[PDB]
Design a protein around this nucleic acid. Structure first.
Ligand SMILES: Cc1cn([C@H]2C[C@H](O)[C@@H](COP(=O)(O)OP(=O)(O)OP(=O)(O)O)O2)c(=O)[nH]c1=O
Ligand SMILES: [Ca+2]
Ligand SMILES: [Ca+2]
Ligand SMILES: [Ca+2]
Ligand SMILES: [Ca+2]
Length: 901
DNA sequence: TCGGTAAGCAGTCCGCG
DNA sequence: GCGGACTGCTTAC
């Protein structure tokens, strides 16, 4: 097999590399790598190395990496550019793996672990590590085993061994329900003392050294705790055995308001799963406890126990250990679904970076561009210091707030990357500038044509047309990968809808789910077989189709995020290729493209309808337009359609056969006007929306910019079994909105769009009457909580104290003195409830850590004093009033002359 | 929360005769 | 009471 790296580090003058050799074995080597850097040289000097602008360079080979670093410093002292890859390990990988890396995940040791630490006096601080580690569960992907290290004797209690037999039993048998599929994979090791436990764990780690190390909060808790505890008991040298090269560093992570410490383990790649999830999931959750995320992702129930976690080991050691094991498994289950480790490996090996560097789009693109340029013996520029400067972004149209009955939307494919490719925007393709007219003049095609030679953006920049820049070349490669995965995602989505339709008529039989590839549209033969399947088999197939869609979504949306990240990196001062001329060339071209095509679409539809000056485009944001289709439907007449699907078909065909060719002609003209390199503005129909045929539903409404709701029948070629609400920006979509209120507001919207005013009034009346019975957690608001200290004046709110922070201060006074009460953590999320006048907490609200029940001490008083009237007005009535006023509807029935009968 | 801009709403403070 | 200046937080792209 072809060799591939696992990890790489620089330690002084050596590169330490772990890798898989040509025979598939894991090896380690230390290499005295001699790096090269570059200086500009005279034109009359033979070289094969050129910078990105075509100026000749001489290569300087150093005796060691320290010599190279010192040379960079002296070049700064002189005032001359020091060119080349200054991150020597990236250069090492580029020289050692000079081909497209083909990796074999089965050879990569991925470890998932979790620790338990009993603590009487609050949260066990990892930097102190003053309490025994009393359990470790460590799953190894190569062994496919859960290694369980269990402390039986502690200063906080002596316990009996954990029983695998009880662990396996149902909770209704008094068991812990450890999933049967992992029971045979557990290797249980009990210990008489903590010193022996940790010594054995280190010997185990030496034998089975993680390449990828993951788990939940491992970077901020488990790793520093284990390192510091071993340090405290045995000394520094022993703790450093967690690194295969015996090297560690305390790293200070700084933010806006403070800092924290993590431990860097040289020769390991730590990918904390909470951080993978936050980067790659595109969710914003009210809590990031593993129980909360597990319930959201997997629909598994919360891990139930009695009393505080600090007393769990002593009271129920059996459950304590089972729950440690289950926590490790839940992370593996989330990854089986979301496939974030797979994604990280794919992108890391593609770029040729340390795998943990996938968190940084700047580092990722630096490496991709470096490797690409090196292939042509070109030499990268030195990174420079720049002051942070604001720059302009997208255009968003101000919509007229209203109901909109029939709507079709259109959207540009991969806009910012397509602009980069069309215009040919790159550091080395800058050709010069032209004299800019107001943007309006380009939009309306009255400005002078910018150039007869170069490719232009309306910010004034011109670009070469003779050859593609490196940024367009490399962005195209990742875009093509994205396109492939998006295809699989959409096919799985369409396949899912076929199964949903079939589920209306399930067959009374015993059979099996079909063995199919859900990434490809079902054949006619498969469709025929599906129509004969049982509900059991169909539901299994739906679950599998949906898992295939999730896998495709992970792969496509994150490749989209990477290519959009390159457009953004051009506007980040830490990027080697930072240039506001290029960042603004992208965003300004986008503003023009949207407004240009709004004009062309209005012109086309006014012509087909025989009117003048009427606005068909009701809204647009960045690269999308929303078109009123009422007049199109009315030209046919509603009574002429057989059912909803009939007019949906008609609009689908109108969009494809009439509107898209008109849009294409419009953009081709724009490409010629700007003299661009290649026409790549591809705007296809996205949504077809409207009320059910014959209903009193309103179809859709807008309240303002980035705030609308549509009843959608077809999305990007997926024809839904049931209409789907597309809601953007409204409170239903915000993590700050109470869970039960999101649900109620969504039902109000559904009723408005699908059924009409009377239906809305009926539901509102019921919600208002019953909502006080809702569980307190479900009606609590949520907020991140920063700067608690800034606003705390002797335990009371200082000037301008935010509402949620006020709630935290209230909580802190109520729990004062208690060492075991859950503390609110700076920067994390809290639940918030309003309090009625004259409550014993002495303020108008209270807040506590999100994802948790409020502590028993004050729970009774919180429930008794919760202000339901304020809660309802603020979270439900006010947003609903906004929706209904915009849609010209009433949520309460107004008096009529009929009330007289 | 270590890792592009536009823009909405909640809440504080305070003016507005 | 509602709007502007401002902070804080959270979305849509
Ligand atoms: C979603 C998103 C968009 N944008 C910018 C760049 C996008 O090209 C532009 C439009 O966003 P989108 O229409 O969401 O995305 P897209 O056009 O890149 O891709 P698709 O093919 O799925 O339509 O907004 C960002 O800069 N960052 C982001 O996270
Ligand atoms: Ca735990
Ligand atoms: Ca788009
Ligand atoms: Ca059937
Ligand atoms: Ca869009």
């Amino acid at each position: 097999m072809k060799e591939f790296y696992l990890t790489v580090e620089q330690i002084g003058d050596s590169i330490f590399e772990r890798y898989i050799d040509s025979n598939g074995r894991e090896r380690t080597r230390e290499v005295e790598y001699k790096p090269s850097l570059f200086a500009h040289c005279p034109e009359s000097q033979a070289t094969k190395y050129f910078d990105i602008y075509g100026k000749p360079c001489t290569r300087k080979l150093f005796a060691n990496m320290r010599d190279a670093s010192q040379w960079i410093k002296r070049m700064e002292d002189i005032g001359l550019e020091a060119l080349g890859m200054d991150d020597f390990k990236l250069a090492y990988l580029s020289d050692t793996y000079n081909y497209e890396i083909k990796y074999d995940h089965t050879k990569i040791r991925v470890a998932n672990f979790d620790i338990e630490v009993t603590s009487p006096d609050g949260f066990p601080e990892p930097s102190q590590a003053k309490h025994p580690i009393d359990a470790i569960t460590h799953y190894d992907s190569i062994d496919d085993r859960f290694y369980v290290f269990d402390l039986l004797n502690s200063p906080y209690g002596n316990v009996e061994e954990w029983s695998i037999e009880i662990a396996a039993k149902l909770q209704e048998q008094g068991g812990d329900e450890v999933p049967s599929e992992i029971i045979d994979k557990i290797i249980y090791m009990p210990f008489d003392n903590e010193k022996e436990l940790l010594m054995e764990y280190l010997n185990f780690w030496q034998q089975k050294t993680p390449v990828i190390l993951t788990g939940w909060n491992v970077e901020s808790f488990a790793i520093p705790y284990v390192y510091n505890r071993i340090k405290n008991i045995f000394g520094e040298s022993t703790a450093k055995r967690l690194s295969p090269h015996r090297k560690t560093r305390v790293k200070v992570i700084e933010n806006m308001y403070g800092s924290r410490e993590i431990i860097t383990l040289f020769g390991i790649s730590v990918l904390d799963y909470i951080d993978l999830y936050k980067k790659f999931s595109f969710t914003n959750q009210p809590s990031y406890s593993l129980d909360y995320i597990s319930e959201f992702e997997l629909n598994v129930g919360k891990l139930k126990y009695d009393g505080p976690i600090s007393k769990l080991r002593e009271s129920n050691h059996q459950r304590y250990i089972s729950y440690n094991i289950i926590a490790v498994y839940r992370v593996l289950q989330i990854d089986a679904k979301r496939q974030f480790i797979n994604l990280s490996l794919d992108m890391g090996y593609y770029a040729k970076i340390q795998i943990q560097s996938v968190f940084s789009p700047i580092k990722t693109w630096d490496a991709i561009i470096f490797n690409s340029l090196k292939e042509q013996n070109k030499v990268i520029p030195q990174g420079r210091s720049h002051p942070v400067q604001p720059y302009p972004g997208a255009f968003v149209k101000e919509p007229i707030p209203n109901r909109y009955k029939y709507v079709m939307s259109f959207d540009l494919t991969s806009l910012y990357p397509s602009i980069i490719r069309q215009v040919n925007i790159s550091p080395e393709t800058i050709a010069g500038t032209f004299k800019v007219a107001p943007l309006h003049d380009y939009i309306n095609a009255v400005a002078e044509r910018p150039s007869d030679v170069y490719s232009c953006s309306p910010n004034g920049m011109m670009y070469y047309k003779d050859r593609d820049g490196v940024v367009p070349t490399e962005i195209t490669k990742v875009f093509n990968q994205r396109k492939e995965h998006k295809g699989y995602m959409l096919a799985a989505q369409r396949n899912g809808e076929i199964i949903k339709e079939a589920l209306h008529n399930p067959n009374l039989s015993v059979d099996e789910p079909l063995d199919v590839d859900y990434r490809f549209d079902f054949s006619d033969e498969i469709k025929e077989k599906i129509k004969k399947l049982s509900a059991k088999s169909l539901n299994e197939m739906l679950f599998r189709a949906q898992r295939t869609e999730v896998a495709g979504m992970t792969a496509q949306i994150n490749r989209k995020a990477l290519i959009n990240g390159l457009a953004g990196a051009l506007g980040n001062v830490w990027f080697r290729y930072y240039d506001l001329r290029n960042a603004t060339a992208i965003t300004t071209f986008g503003q023009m493209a949207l407004q240009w095509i709004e004009r062309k679409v209005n012109e086309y539809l006014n012509e087909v309808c025989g009117t003048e000056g009427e606005a068909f485009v009701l809204y647009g944001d960045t690269d999308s337009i929303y078109v009123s289709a009422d007049k199109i439907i009315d030209k046919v007449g509603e009574s002429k359609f057989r059912d909803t699907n009939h007019w949906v078909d008609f609009l689908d065909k109108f969009a494809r056969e009439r509107m898209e060719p008109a849009i294409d002609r419009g953009f081709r003209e724009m490409c010629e006007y700007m003299n661009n390199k290649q026409h790549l503005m591809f705007m296809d129909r996205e949504a077809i929306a409207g009320p059910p045929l014959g209903s009193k539903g309103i179809g859709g409404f807008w309240t303002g910019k980035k705030r609308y709701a549509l009843n959608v029948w077809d999305m990007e070629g997926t024809r839904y079994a049931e209409p789907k609400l597309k809601i953007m920006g409204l409170e239903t979509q915000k993590s700050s909105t109470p869970k039960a209120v999101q649900k109620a507001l969504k039902e109000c919207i559904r009723r408005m769009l699908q059924e009409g005013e009377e239906s809305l009034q009926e539901y509102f009346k019921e919600f208002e009457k019953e909502f006080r019975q809702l569980n307190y957690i479900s009606i609590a608001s949520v907020s991140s909580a920063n700067n608690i200290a800034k606003y705390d004046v002797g335990g009371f709110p200082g000037p301008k104290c935010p509402f949620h922070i006020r709630g935290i201060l209230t909580y802190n006074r109520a729990i004062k003195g208690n060492i075991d009460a859950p503390q609110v953590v700076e920067g994390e999320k809290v639940y918030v409830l309003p309090l009625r006048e004259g409550n014993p907490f002495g303020d108008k609200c209270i807040a506590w850590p999100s994802g948790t029940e409020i502590t028993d001490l004050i729970k009774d008083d919180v429930l008794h004093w919760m202000d339901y009237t304020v809660l309802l007005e603020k979270t439900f009535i006010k947003p609903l009033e906004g929706f209904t006023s915009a849609a010209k509807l009433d949520y309460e029935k107004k008096a009529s002359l009929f009330d007289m009968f």
